Design a binder for this molecule. Structure first.
Ligand SMILES: Cc1cc2nc3c(=O)[nH]c(=O)nc-3n(C[C@H](O)[C@H](O)[C@H](O)COP(=O)(O)OP(=O)(O)OC[C@H]3O[C@@H](n4cnc5c(N)ncnc54)[C@H](O)[C@@H]3O)c2cc1C
Ligand SMILES: Cc1cc2nc3c(=O)[nH]c(=O)nc-3n(C[C@H](O)[C@H](O)[C@H](O)COP(=O)(O)OP(=O)(O)OC[C@H]3O[C@@H](n4cnc5c(N)ncnc54)[C@H](O)[C@@H]3O)c2cc1C
Ligand SMILES: COc1cc2c(cc1OC)-c1cc3cc(O)ccc3n1C2=O
Ligand SMILES: COc1cc2c(cc1OC)-c1cc3cc(O)ccc3n1C2=O
Ligand SMILES: [Zn+2]
Ligand SMILES: [Zn+2]
Lengths: 230, 230
C-alpha cells in the first residue's frame, strides 16, 4: 500500500464542469498509482430517501418506525439494504473521500444529501462515544470539491452570500468532522459558467496541480473559529 | 380574510414528535379559521432528485444537460413535471410556509432538500436579478420548526455542535431569504428522545401556544450578525 480514493460525484451531465473535475481527479490519482473508485450517484439512480426499505427482512419495531434506531440495529445485524452496504464498503476501504458537487442552496444536491443521510449511519460513521475527533472514520481524509453559481466577490464576508466558510460548516464540521474525518481545505471552483474557456482550464488545472501533492497536505482545524472567527 | 398556511412536513412516522408538532399546528391554525395545507413528503413519495425527468418539453440544449437552465425555461414554457407545479401552486397561495422536520446532519432530510432544489426554481422563487429582498416570493412568511438529537447545551457557542443559529444559515438565509420570504424565529424542539414525558408535552404546548399569536410576530433580521454575532 498504496492509497485508496473514493470520489462521490453528484452531477447529471458528464460534459459538465463537475464531470471534467471528476475525470481530472481520476486521471491524476490513477497516474500516481492510487486505487480509485467513483460513486456516480445520478448514474446509479441513487436512492436519497431515508425510509423503512433501507432495512432488509423484519423490523425491530414495526409499530412506530424510528429511522435512526432501526438503521443502527440493521447495521449491527448486517441487515441494511445493499445500496447502503456497498457505499459503506467503499468508505471503509478509502483513505481519502472526495465529494464532487455543484452547490445547491448553500449545500449539497439532495441526491448527495441522501448519501450522507443513508450511508453514514450510527455504528458505521459514529457512535457514543466515537464522534468528532473520536468518530469511527478517524484517520480518513475528506475533501469537498464544490462548484458555485456565484462569483468569489459574492462569497466574501460582506458580499450578498456571506463567507464561503459559513455554508461549509454543516458539511465540514457537522457532517465530516463529526464522523472522524480530517478535512482538507475545500476546493471551490467559483462561477465556472460566466467564465472564459481559459479561466476554466486554469481552474481544472489547479485542481489537477493540487492533487499532485494531496498526500503531503495538512488538515484544516475544523472549528467554529475556522468557519466564523478571525 | 383570512390567511393561508402550507406545512411542508418531512417525517416517516405519523406517531413521531414531528407528527405531533405537525398535528397541533394543523389543529391550532384550523381553529383560528386559517386555510391549512400539508405536504407530507414521505407519504407523497416525493422525488428529491434533480433530473431531466423534471422537464417534459424540448430541451434548450439537448447535447449538454444543465438543470438550472432547463427548469428555468421549462417553468416559463409550462413544461415542468406536474409534481413540481402542484407544489408551486401551494407555495403561491400561501401566506405562511412552515417546514416541519428532524435535523439531519445540521440540515434538512434529503427529501425536503429535494423539495427546495426542485420546487424553488428560477422564474418561480427568484430571478437574476430579483433575489434576497427582491426575491419573487416577497410578502410571504417562512418558519422552520426543527427537532434535534442533541440538547440545547450542545447547541451553544461553547457546546460541541456550536450555536444552533450556525446551521440555520443555509436554510434561513441562503434559501428562504434569497427567495424573498420574511423569516420568522425558528422553533427548535431540542432533544425530544432524551426529554421526560412532561418536558415533551410542554414542548408540544409551547409550539401550540406560539402559533396562537403567530400573525403578530415580526420577522428576524436575517443577516450574518443574527446568525453569527461577533
Ligand atoms: C437547484 C439549484 C440550486 C442552486 N443553488 C446555488 C447556490 O446556493 N449558490 C450558488 O452559487 N449557485 C447555486 N446554483 C448554481 C450552481 O451551483 C452552478 O450552476 C454550478 O455550480 C455550475 O457547475 P456545472 O458543473 O453544472 O457548470 P457547467 O454549466 O456544466 O459548466 C460551465 C461551463 O464549463 C464548460 N466545461 C466543461 N468542462 C470543462 C473543462 N474541461 N474545461 C473548461 N470548461 C469546461 C461547460 O461546457 C460549460 O460551458 C444552484 C443551481 C441549482 C440548479
Ligand atoms: C440521518 C440522521 C441524521 C441526523 N443528524 C442529526 C444532527 O445533525 N444533529 C442532531 O442534533 N440530530 C441529528 N439526528 C437526530 C434527529 O434530529 C432526531 O432523532 C429527531 O429530531 C427526533 O425527532 P423525532 O420526531 O423522530 O422524535 P421521536 O423519536 O419520534 O420522539 C421522541 C419521543 O416523543 C414521543 N412523542 C411523540 N409525540 C408526542 C407527544 N404528543 N407528546 C409527548 N411525547 C410524544 C415519541 O413517541 C417518542 O417516544 C439525525 C438523525 C438521523 C436519522
Ligand atoms: C449567488 O448566489 C446564489 C446563486 C444561485 C442560487 C442561489 C444563490 O444563493 C443562495 C440558486 C438557486 C438556484 C436554483 C435553480 O433551479 C437554478 C439556479 C439557482 N441558483 C443560482 O445561480
Ligand atoms: C448531537 O449532535 C448530533 C446527533 C446526531 C447526529 C449528528 C449530530 O451532530 C452533527 C446524527 C447523525 C445520524 C445518522 C443516523 O442514521 C442516525 C442518527 C444520527 N445522529 C444523531 O443522533
Ligand atoms: Zn469541525
Ligand atoms: Zn438572510
Amino acid at each position: 500500500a498504496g492509497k485508496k480514493v473514493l470520489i462521490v460525484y453528484a452531477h447529471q451531465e458528464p460534459k459538465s464542469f463537475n464531470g471534467s473535475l471528476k475525470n481530472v481527479a481520476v486521471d491524476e490519482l490513477s497516474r500516481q498509482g492510487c486505487t480509485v473508485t467513483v460513486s456516480d450517484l445520478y448514474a446509479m439512480n441513487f436512492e436519497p430517501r431515508a425510509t423503512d426499505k433501507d432495512i432488509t427482512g423484519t423490523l425491530s419495531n414495526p409499530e412506530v418506525f424510528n429511522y435512526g434506531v432501526e438503521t443502527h440495529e440493521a447495521y449491527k445485524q448486517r441487515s441494511l439494504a445493499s445500496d447502503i452496504t456497498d457505499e459503506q464498503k467503499k468508505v471503509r476501504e478509502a483513505d481519502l473521500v472526495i465529494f464532487q458537487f455543484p452547490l445547491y442552496w448553500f449545500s449539497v444536491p439532495a441526491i448527495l444529501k441522501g448519501w450522507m443521510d443513508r450511508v453514514l449511519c450510527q455504528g458505521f460513521a459514529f457512535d457514543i462515544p466515537g464522534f468528532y475527533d473520536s468518530g469511527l472514520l478517524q484517520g480518513k481524509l475528506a475533501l469537498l470539491s464544490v462548484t458555485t453559481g456565484g462569483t468569489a466577490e459574492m462569497y466574501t464576508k460582506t458580499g450578498v452570500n456571506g463567507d464561503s466558510r459559513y455554508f461549509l460548516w454543516p458539511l465540514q464540521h457537522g457532517t465530516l468532522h463529526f464522523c472522524g474525518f480530517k478535512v482538507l481545505a475545500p476546493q471551490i471552483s467559483f462561477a465556472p459558467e460566466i467564465a472564459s474557456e481559459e479561466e476554466r482550464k486554469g481552474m481544472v488545472a489547479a485542481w489537477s496541480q493540487r492533487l499532485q501533492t494531496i498526500w503531503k497536505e495538512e488538515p484544516i482545524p475544523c472549528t467554529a473559529h475556522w468557519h466564523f472567527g478571525q
